[PDB]
Amino acid sequence: AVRLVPHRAIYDLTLDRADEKSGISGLTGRMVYEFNGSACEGYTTNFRFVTRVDMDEQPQRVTDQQTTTFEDADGKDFRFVNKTFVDKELVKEVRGDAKLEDGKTVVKLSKPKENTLDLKGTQFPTRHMEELIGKAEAGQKFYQTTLFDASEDADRVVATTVVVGKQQAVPDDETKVMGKFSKDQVWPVTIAYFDDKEQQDGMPIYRINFKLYRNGITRDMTMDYGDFSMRGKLVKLDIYD
């Protein structure tokens, strides 16, 4: 019984920490997230991820990831498109479908190649987000689950461990931008992503920390990619009707 609010949110990306291994000297970027739909309607998610990464030796590299998804009301279907541009050239495109039928996840992909995949039964991003809020509202602070998000190659189920903290409402730069929801409580949330196939030290493949609102909005993002981490700060929030 969670009602995610339709909105457009623009985040400004900055470099948090850089490993020597990474070779990254700078990273500025932006992310634009738009989410619309309804339990009756369904959910449409549009997002673009742009990172300008500086390398000392090399010329700048600007990666633009553009994606669009749709998830059905019942949460049994999930349509997805992944485009990735490197210095303005489309270098990767991922496009397919997945359905929740027979406690299995059948993934039908249009691109790069035409392929079907029976995977482990799971949940999709809107449902998972909804479960995160519910568990949080009901006082839960630690749990394990799986997810299919159609990121990277869209060929697997990811185990996600969620850790929730105490509700806080500390006004910051992000809050001023938001408006009416600016004075609402948030839950600190850390999601660590694990894959069964291999872990270097049982390390998660990716980890993100964020502050989450009851209505699905999030801010104060930090993405740990391993060697390097990125920061995402909300800079503009548009609340739809």
- Rg for CA atoms: 18 Å
Cross-sheet strand order for the largest sheet: 8-7-6-5-4-3-2-1-14-13-12-11-10-9
Helix tally? 2
The portion of residues forming beta strands comes to: over 45%
Q: Order of helices and strands, N to C?
A: EEEEEEEEHEEHEEEE
Structural class: mainly beta
In total, the number of domains comes to 1
Distance between the termini: 19 Å
Portion in helices = under 10%
Beta-strand segment tally: 14
The biggest beta sheet reads: 14 strands, antiparallel
Q: What best-fitting shape do the alpha-carbon axes yield?
A: globular
Pick out its properties.
about 10% helix, 14 strands, globular, 2 helices, monomer, mainly beta, about 240 residues, 14-stranded antiparallel β-sheet
Can you offer a commentary on this structure?
The chain has one domain. The protein is built from two helices and 14 strands; from the N terminus they run E-E-E-E-E-E-E-E-H-E-E-H-E-E-E-E. A 14-stranded antiparallel β-sheet has the order 8-7-6-5-4-3-2-1-14-13-12-11-10-9. The chain is globular. The PDB classes it as unknown function. Keywords: Midwest Center for Structural Genomics, mcsg, unknown function.
Gist of the model:
The protein is built from two helices and 14 strands. By secondary structure, it is mainly β.
Write the layout of secondary structure elements.
Elements: E1 7-18, E2 24-38, E3 42-55, E4 61-71, E5 77-86, E6 89-101, E7 104-111, E8 115-120, H1 125-137, E9 142-147, E10 158-164, H2 173-178, E11 186-194, E12 206-213, E13 218-224, E14 228-239
Antiparallel strand pairs: 1-2, 1-14, 2-3, 3-4, 4-5, 5-6, 6-7, 7-8, 9-10, 10-11, 11-12, 12-13, 13-14
